[PDB]
Amino acid sequence: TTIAGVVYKDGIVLGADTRATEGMVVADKNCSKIHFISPNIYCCGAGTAADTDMTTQLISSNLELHSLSTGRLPRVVTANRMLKQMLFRYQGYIGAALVLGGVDVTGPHLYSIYPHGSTDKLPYVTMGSGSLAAMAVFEDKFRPDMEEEEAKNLVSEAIAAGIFNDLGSGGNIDLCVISKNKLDFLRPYTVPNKKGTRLGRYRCEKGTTAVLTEKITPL
Amino acid sequence: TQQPIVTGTSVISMKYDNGVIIAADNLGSYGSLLRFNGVERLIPVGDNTVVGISGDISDMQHIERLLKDLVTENAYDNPLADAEEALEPSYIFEYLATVMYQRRSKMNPLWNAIIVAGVQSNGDQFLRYVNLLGVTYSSPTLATGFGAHMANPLLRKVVDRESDIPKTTVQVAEEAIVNAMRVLYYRDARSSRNFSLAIIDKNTGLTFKKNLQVENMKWDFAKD
Amino acid sequence: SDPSSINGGIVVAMTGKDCVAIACDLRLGSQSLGVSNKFEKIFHYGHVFLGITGLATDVTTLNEMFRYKTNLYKLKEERAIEPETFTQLVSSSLYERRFGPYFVGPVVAGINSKSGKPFIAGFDLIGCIDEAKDFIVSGTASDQLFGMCESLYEPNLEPEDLFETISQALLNAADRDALSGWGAVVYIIKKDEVVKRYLKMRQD
Amino acid sequence: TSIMAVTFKDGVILGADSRTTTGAYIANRVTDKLTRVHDKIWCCRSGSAADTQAIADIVQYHLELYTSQYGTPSTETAASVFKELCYENKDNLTAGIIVAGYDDKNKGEVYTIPLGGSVHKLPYAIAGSGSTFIYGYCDKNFRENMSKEETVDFIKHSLSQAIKWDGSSGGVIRMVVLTAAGVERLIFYPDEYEQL
Amino acid sequence: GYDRHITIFSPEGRLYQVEYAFKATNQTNINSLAVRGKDCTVVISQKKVPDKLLDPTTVSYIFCISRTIGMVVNGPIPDARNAALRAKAEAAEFRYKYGYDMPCDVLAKRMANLSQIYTQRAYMRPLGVILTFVSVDEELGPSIYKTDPAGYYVGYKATATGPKQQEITTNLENHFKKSKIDHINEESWEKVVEFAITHMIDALGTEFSKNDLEVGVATKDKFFTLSAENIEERLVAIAEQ
Amino acid sequence: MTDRYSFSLTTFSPSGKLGQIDYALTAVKQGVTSLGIKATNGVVIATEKKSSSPLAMSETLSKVSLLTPDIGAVYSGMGPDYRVLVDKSRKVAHTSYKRIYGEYPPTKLLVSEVAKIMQEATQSGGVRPFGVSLLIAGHDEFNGFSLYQVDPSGSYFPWKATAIGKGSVAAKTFLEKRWNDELELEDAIHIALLTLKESVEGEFNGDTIELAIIGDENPDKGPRFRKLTSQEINDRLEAL
Amino acid sequence: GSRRYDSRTTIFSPEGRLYQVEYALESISHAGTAIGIMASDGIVLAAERKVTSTLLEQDTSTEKLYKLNDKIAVAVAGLTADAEILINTARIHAQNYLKTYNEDIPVEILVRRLSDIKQGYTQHGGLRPFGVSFIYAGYDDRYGYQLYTSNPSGNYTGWKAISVGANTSAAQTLLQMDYKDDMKVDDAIELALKTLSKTTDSSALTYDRLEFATIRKGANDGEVYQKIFKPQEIKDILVKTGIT
Amino acid sequence: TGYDLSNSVFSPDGRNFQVEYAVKAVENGTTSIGIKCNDGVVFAVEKLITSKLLVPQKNVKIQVVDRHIGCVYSGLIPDGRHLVNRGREEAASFKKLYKTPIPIPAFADRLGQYVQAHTLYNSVRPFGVSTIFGGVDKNGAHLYMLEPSGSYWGYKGAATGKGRQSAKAELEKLVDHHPEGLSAREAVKQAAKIIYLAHEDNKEKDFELEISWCSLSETNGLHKFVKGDLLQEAIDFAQKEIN
Ligand SMILES: *C[C@@](C)(O)[C@](*)(O)[C@H](Cc1ccccc1)NC(=O)[C@H](Cc1ccc(OC)cc1)NC(=O)[C@H](C)NC(=O)CN1CCOCC1
Ligand SMILES: *C[C@@](C)(O)[C@](*)(O)[C@H](Cc1ccccc1)NC(=O)[C@H](Cc1ccc(OC)cc1)NC(=O)[C@H](C)NC(=O)CN1CCOCC1
Ligand SMILES: [Cl-]
Ligand SMILES: [Mg+2]
Ligand SMILES: [Mg+2]
Ligand SMILES: [Mg+2]
Ligand SMILES: [Mg+2]
Ligand SMILES: [Mg+2]
User: Which domain of life does this protein belong to (chain B)?
Assistant: First the structure.
C-alpha cells in the first residue's frame, strides 16, 4: 500500500493508492483506504486491511461519543492518543499502520502511527510497502508552507511513485484535502492507468452450459 | 523467567574468634562493559548485620528496599526495637531465604546470590548463604560466584574447620580477606580494584570500611 | 494441516443488469478422500444470499449463526435484512474472533429490495470487506476463478447471458483444482424471482 | 540512539540525536527524543520507541497527579516512577531512559535507568547504541561544575562523535537546558557539528 | 417514613435526602462569589478561622484541580476534599486518555453525573457540597460552572453560593443590568478581583481584612490562589478610591 | 463498603400499584411542559427553557438532545436523570447497533433500548426508577417519520402528537383540535409554538424556548435532526 | 445496615401464599383483557388496548400482541416493559433451540422456559416478580395447535379457550357457554370479539381499541402463517361480525 | 425521626447523627494533646491507671507511622489502631512509588479520605476516635487533628478527650505568650504540665504520663519516645507547676 500525508500552508493533504491484495493476487483494484475519523480528521490505512478498517471505525465511534458529550469538534491529539494506546496494548498483533491527518482549533496536525504504538509528529509522512518510493518524492520536492494545488500535486506524485515502482501498490490515486474552511474528499483524484481493453468476446451463448435440474421460487 | 543485565561479581566472607568479616567490590558490569564503578553491594541492617549481594543489580536494589522496609516494620509498636526485639541476622536471613525460594517456585526468581553476615544477641557468629534457587548453607568461609573457586581455597587455609575459629584473630582474618580480594582482581575479568569491607564484632560492633583498594600488585614479571 | 484446504471447495458471485448470480461446487473431502458430493455452500436469509468456502465445520457453524442473527433481526426490525446491512453483520461477526478466527471465505450476494441495486461482497477470514461491483471469488481454486472471471466477465449482462459466464467460470476453474468440483449449483437472482440450476460436470 | 544528560554549575543539560530507524531505513530523521515529564524534569529516551513513549506518557500522568496533591515533585521522585515501571515490567519492555531535572534546593541531578530497571544517580550519563563509542572521550573530558557554554560544547563534541561512528544515530543534535532561569531548547545541524 | 432516609421517591415526587444534603451545604456559614473578566475568571470566598490554635494557612475551601481549573466548595470540608481528590484524579485521567487539558465544563458535567448516581443508588449518600469550577478555557474563554447534590449543573456569567447567596446574586444581577454585558470589562485580573471584593462588601455589608478573604484567579494556562499579602494590596487599592 | 442493596426498592403494594413508578410519574408531572407534533414531511419537539437564575447561561443547559443524526429527544421531570439516559442512549446506539450493522438504529429500536434501561431501574436491586418521561422524535428509511413517548415504567407508545409535564392535560386537548394528517412541517412548528405559549408564564421568545425538528437532510446522507436557532424561532413568532 | 429497608419479596405468608405474586396478579386484573381461542383449523388472539386517545398512532403501535417466532405468538396482560424483557428472552431461547437441533422449538418447551424464569424471581434473588401474564398461541408438529397461559407465579396451563387481565371471571363464563370442540377459526374470531364486546369497561368496542391476530395452517401447501391484523382489517371484521 | 439509627443518613438539619454520636465516644476517652514547636512536634497522652496490677510503661498508646510521623488518639483505642494500620499502608505505598517519605499534609489527607469514607455508607460505622498526629518533612514541622467526620485542620496546638477544654485553654496561653515560637525541649515540659492540669477532669484514678516527639535538631526529624531522665525532668516540672 502507498499512503502519505503532508502539512501545507492552510492545512493537510492526505493520499492513498487503491490496490487490495491477497497473496500475490489483486482482489480489489478500486479499494478505499482514506478513513473518516471525525468531520475534521481523516486517517489513511496500511497493513492488515481488517485491522486498519476496524481500528479507525472504533476510534471514530468513540470520538463521536466524546464530541457529543463535550459539544465541540475533536482534536487530532486525542485521535492520536486513542489509536496509539490501543495499538500499544495489543503489542503489535493489531497490524495497523496509519497516517492520521486533521485540522483542530490549534491548527493542522499530521501523524504517523505504527502497529506497536509508536507515533511520529511530522510535516510529511509515508507508510506501507510503497513508503520508500513515496518518501523519495518528498525528500526530492517537499518544502514547508506550500500552497494547496502544489501540495496536492506533491502527494499525488508521491503516491504515483508507489503505484508504479512498488508491486504492492496500484490502481487509482485518492486524496483528502483538509483545511479550516473546507474538506475536499477526492476519489478518484487521478486514474494513472487505463483499464486494459479486451480484443475478443469470450462470453458463451445461451444453452452452452449443461444443466441437470432447475427450480424457480417467487418472493 | 528473565536474564540478569547489570551484574555484581563475588561477595566473600569468613568467621573469626569474636565475629565475622564480609567484602565485595564496587562494580556493576553490563556484560563485558565495566559500566558502573560506584555501586555499593554490602548493605547493613541495624548495627549487627551486613547483607552482601551478588548477581543482578536491579534485583539487589529491590532486596535493599525490602530490608529497609523490614527495619521500619519491626519498629512499629515495638518499644524494644533498639534492644531485645531488634532485628537479628538469623531473622533477616530467614526472611530473604523465604523470599528467594518462593520466587524460584513461581518461576520468577530474584537473580542473586546473597551472604548474610552478622553477630547474634548471645555473641554467636552468623554467616549463611542463599541464592536464586533458595539453596542455603553455612560454613566458616563463604563466597559467591567466582570467589567460591579462588577466595575459598585461600580463606580455608586460615579456617579449615570449626575448631580454627577461636584461634583466628580479627587482624589475621582481615588480612586474609584483603589478600583474597587482590587475587580476585588479578584473575576475575568482571571485577574491580575498588571495594568495601565490613567487620561485625561482638565487642567493637559494626565497622564499615569504604573506598578500599587492591595494592601490593606484582606485575614486574611481565616485562620478561 | 492448513485449515482452509482440508475440505476444499469454491464460491463465485457476479452482478448483471438488474440481477446477481452466485455459484458453488458440491465437494466435501478429507484432503485426498472425497466424502460427499451434496455439500452445498450457498445459503439464504430472506432475499440475501451467503456463500461460504473453507473449513466445513465453520461453514456449517456460521450458517447456523447467521440464520440465528438474521431471524432476531427480522423480529425486532419488522423487515428482512438487506445485503448492505448483512455484509456489515458478517464483517463484525468475523472480526470478533480476530485472534481465533473461523477459517472461511464468505461471499454475500443479493438485490436491495428498496433501491433495486444489485449487490455483491467478499471477506477474508477476519472480516475485511472486498466491496467490488464486478465479481467476488473464494476457495481453493480462487486464483483459477480470478483468471476466469477477469477474461470472461463484462458489465450489465442479462440473467441468462450472466448464467453462461458464471457457470463457465466455475466449471473450468474447478477442473484445474484437485479439491474442487464433484458437481455445482448456480443461483440466478432477480428482484422477485430466483432460478437455481445444478450443473453437469466431470466427476473426478 | 545517542543520548546524554550532564550536570553543571547552573543546573543540567540533556542532549540527543534525532535518528529513528527501522532496520536500515531512517523512519524519522528529525526525531525529538527529549521529552518533558514536568516543568523542569525531562528525560532522554532510548530503546523501543513505542515502549519509551508509553512509559513517558504514564510518568507525565503520575507527576501531574502528584503535583495536584503534593506540589512540585523532586527529580528523585520522577526517577523512582520511571524505575518502578521499568523494573516491574522488565520482561515486556526495551527501554533505556535518562532522567534529568532542576530543583532549587538540589540544583541539577541526573538519574540513569538501564535495561534491568536499576537506578543510578550520576554527575553525567550516556546511553543508547552510539554511547559505546564515547565512553573513552566522555570520561577524559568531563569536569564537575562546568559553565553552560562548556557543557554545551562537551555534549556537542560527544554526540558528534557518537553520530560519526554509529549508523543508528544521526541527524540534528537537540539539547534542552534546565536552570533557575527556565527551559531553553537548542538545536545543532550537521554542517556545524561535523566539522568539529 | 423510610422514604426520607434513603434516595427513593416520596409520594410528592421528592428526594428528601437530596434536599437535606443541600442544607448541609450551608453548615460552614461561608459565602462564595465568582465573576468573569475579559482574560480571566475570579472566585472569592469568606475565610473564617474561629480557633486561635488553628494554623490559618491550612484553612481553605479553594482547590487547584488542574493547572487550568480551580474549584471552590460550599459545604463541609470532608465532603469538599472527597470531591477535590476525585476531580483531580478525573482531570489527570482525561489528559492521559485524550491528550489535552480537561475543559472546565466537561469536568463539571463529569462530577454532576457522579452526583446524580448518589441520588439514584441507595447505598451511596449524596455529598453535602456545591462545587463551583472556574477556568479560562482555550475554546470557550472565561468560564464558571457549578454542581450541586442533585446532580444539576449549568454555566454562569457570574454566580454566588452560601447562606447570603440571594443578596450577592441580586447585587450582581443589578450591575449586569446596567453594563448590558456578560462580564467585567477589565484588562487586568487585579482589578477584576477588586470588583469581586467590592461587590461582596456592598452585598454583605461587612468590611474585610486580609485574613477574612480567600481569593482564586484563573488566567490562560494557569489557576492560582492569592496570598494574604496579595489580598492586602487588593484591599488597599479598594480603600484608596 | 458493601453495596448490600441487592433487593428491589420498587415492589407491588396490596392494591397492585408499583409505588415508586407512580411517584416518579408525580415527579414528571411537576416538571416543565414539553411536547411533540408529527407532520407529513417532519416531526417537531419543543419545551420551555426554565432558567434557574438570570445569571445562569441557559444556552449551556440543553433540554433537547441529539441521540443519532436522525433522532432527537426532549423530556419533562428530573434533568440529571435525563442527562444519563441521553449518555446511555447515544452509547447503546453505537455498541449494540452501529458497530454491528454499520448504520444507526431506527427510531423504534433506540426507543426500545431506552425503555429497557428504564425498566431495569424499576426492578434491579438498590435503585429507584428514573424520574423522567421522554419524547423521542426520529426518522429512518423503512419506517419514515415517528414520535414516541417513554415513561418511568419502561412503557412506550407512538404518538401523532402529545405533551408531557406541567400543562399536559390542557396541551393535549389543544393539539387534538389542531392536528390533522395533512400537516406540513411549518404548520406543525406553528401549532407547537401556539400550544407552548399556553403553559409558559413569563417571557416567550427564542431565548426562553428550545425547539428542534426531524425533517429534510441538511448538507452518504446529511443529518435530519436540526435544532432551531434563537433567531429562527423569533421569525415565526411574528407570524403567530 | 441495609436489612432495615428490605421488602422481602420471596417469602410465604402464614397462609402459604407468596405476597408479591398475589399482588402482581391484582395488578394484572386491572390490565386490558386478552383472549385466546383455539379452533380445529387455527388459533385466534384478541386483546383490548387501554386508556387510548384520538392522537395515539395505532398502525405503528404494539402493546398487546407480540411475535416470538414464525410459529408462536403471545398476548400480554400487565406491565408492557416487563413483558418485553421476557419476550426477548423467549425469542432467544427459540433461536438457541433452532441452532442446536435444526428444528423449530416445540411450544410447551418455550413456555416452560419462560415460566421457569418467572418462578425463579418468586423463590430467590430478592427482586420483585414480573407483573405479566401471557397467552401463548403456537403450532408445532407434535401437538398441533396449542394455547397456554403463564402468570407471575411461574405456573402455566393449557387451554381450549382462555382470558387474562380484566374481567376474566365474566369472560371465562361467556366463553365456557358458547365454545364447542368442532368450532372453526371464523367462528372463534366472532366469539372472541363478542366476549370482549360484553366484558369491556368502555361504552362501545371500536377498531382503534383492539389488537387482533390469527395463527392459521390455512395457507397454500400446509404451512403455518401468523397474521397480525392491521387497523383497517380489524375495522372490517367488526362490520362483518355485526358489532359496529 | 429515625435519622440517627443509620450511618450516612442526612437529618432534616443536614447532619449525620451517627458521626455526632461517635464524637461522644471520643469525648468519653482520656486526654491526648499535640504541641507544634520551632522545628518539630510533641505528643502527650493521659493513661489512666485502673489498677495496681497494670505494668508501668508497658501499655504504650502513642504509635509511630513510617519513621517520621507520630499518632495519638482519644476514644475507642482499637479504632485508633485500625486507622494507624491503614496510615502505615498508605505511607508504605507512597514511599514505594515516589521514594521520598510521605509528607505530613499528604499523609493527613490519606487518613482524612479514609475516615470520610466511613460516613458514606450504612454498612460501616464511623471511627470512634479523634486522632492528633504529625511530624517533620521537607517543608518543616506540621501538627494535625482528625475528627470522626473526616474533618482535619493544621494546628499550633491540639487537644481532645475528656480534658480537652482545660488543655485548649492552656494551649491558647502558650500561643499568645510565645509568638516567636516554642523550643522542642520546652514543648516536652509544657506537654507534661498540660496533661497534669487536664487530669483534674479524670481526677478519681491516678494516671501515667506518656510523651513522644519529632524534632529536626533533637531527634534528626525522626519520631522517638521521651524516656528516662528527660521524662522524669518533664514530670518534675509538671508536678512543680500544679503545686
Ligand atoms: C500494499 C498493501 C496492499 O499491503 C496495503 O497495505 C493494503 C492496505 C489496505 C487497507 C484497507 C483495505 C484494503 C487494503 N493491505 C492489504 O491489502 C493486506 C496485505 C496484507 C496481507 C497479509 C498480511 O499479514 C500480516 C498483512 C497485510 N491484505 C489483506 O489484509 C487481505 C485482504 N487479507 C489477507 O491477506 C488475509 N490475512 C490472513 C492472515 O492475517 C492477515 C490477513
Ligand atoms: C539508536 C536508536 C535510533 O535506535 C535509538 O535507540 C531509538 C530511540 C528512540 C527513537 C524514537 C523515539 C524515541 C527514542 N530507537 C529506535 O529508533 C527504535 C529501535 C529499536 C527497535 C526495537 C527495539 O526492541 C524491540 C529496540 C530499539 N526504533 C523503533 O522502535 C521503530 C519506530 N520501530 C521498529 O523498528 C519496529 N519494530 C518491529 C519489530 O518489533 C519491534 C519494533
Ligand atoms: Cl460521565
Ligand atoms: Mg474499506
Ligand atoms: Mg476438479
Ligand atoms: Mg479425482
Ligand atoms: Mg551516522
Ligand atoms: Mg442514596
Answer: Eukaryota
Q: Determine whether the shortest distance from the Cβ of C131 to ligand 1 is under 6 A.
A: no
State phi, psi for F200 to the nearest 5 degrees: -85, 125
d(CA C35, CA D28): 57
Segment holding F236, helix H or strand E = helix F230-238
Q: Which domain holds residue A76?
A: 1-219
| Cβ partners under 8 Å of residue E78, min gap 6 | H112, H115, H116, H119, H149, H150, H151
H172 half-sphere exposure, CB direction, 13 A CA radius? 9
Short-list B200, B205, B10, CA closest to B114: B10
Domain count across chain C: 1
Mapping DSSP to helix (H, G, I), strand (E, B) and coil, where does residue E28 land?
A: coil
Q: What is the CATH number of the domain that holds C160?
A: 3.60.20.10
CB E103 within 8 A of CB F60: no
Which positions 87-126 of G are in contact with C (Cβ < 8 Å)? Answer: 91-92, 95-96, 98-99, 102
| Domain housing C106 | 1-204
Grouping H, G, I as helix, E, B as strand and the rest as coil, residue F202 is coil
Q: What is the resolution of this structure in A?
A: 2.8
Tell me the C-alpha distance between E115 and E147, whole Å.
8
- Which SS3 state, helix, strand or coil, does residue A67 take? helix
Domains recognised in chain F with CATH numbers: 1-240 (3.60.20.10)
In whole angstroms, give the CA distance from residue H39 to residue H33. 18
What's the gap between Cα A47 and its chain centre?
11
Number of domains in chain A: 1
| Domains by residue range for chain D, with CATH | 1-196 (3.60.20.10)
E106 C-alpha vs ligand 3 centroid, how far in Å? 9
Is the torsion defined by CA of A162, A167, A168, A170 positive or negative? Answer: positive
User: Phi and psi of F80, rounded to 5°?
Assistant: -60, -40
Q: How many residues does chain E have?
A: 241
How much is the CA Rg of chain F, to the nearest whole Å? 18
Please give the grid coordinates belonging to residue G92: 432467544
H32-37 β-sheet, strand order: H157-160, H32-37, H40-48, H207-215, H224-225
Number of H helices, E strands in chain A: 4, 13
Q: Which of G95, G213, G72 has the alpha carbon at shortest distance from G146?
A: G72
Judging contact as 3 or more Cβ pairs under 8 Å, the answer for C and B is no
Distance from the C100 Cα atom to the nearest Cα atom in chain G, whole angstroms: 21
Question: The CATH number of the domain where A193 resides is what?
Answer: 3.60.20.10
F9 contact partners, CB below 8 Å, separation of at least 6:
E6, E8, E122, F20, F125, F126, F127, F128, G5
Contact at 8 Å (CB) between G147 and G159? yes
Domains of chain G, with CATH numbers?
1-244 (3.60.20.10)
E100 touches chain H (CB under 8 A): no
Residue A209 Cα distances to C102, C134, C163, angstroms:
34, 21, 9
Question: Cα dihedral angle (B174, B177, B181, B182), rounded to 10 degrees?
Answer: 70
Answer yes or no: are the C-beta atoms of D45 and D82 closer than 8 Å.
no
Which ligand has an atom closest to residue A116 CA? Answer: 2
Catalytic positions of A = 1
- From the number of C-beta atoms within 10 Å of its C-beta (0-12, 13-18, 19+), residue C32 rates as exposed
Method in brief: X-ray
Residue E26: closest CA among E215, E163, E184: E163
Chains G and D are in contact, defined as 3 or more C-beta pairs closer than 8 angstroms: no
Describe the crossing of helices G231-241 and G185-199 by its angle, rounded to 10 degrees. 90
Structural domain including B134 reads 1-224
Alpha carbon distance A71, E95 (integer Å): 17
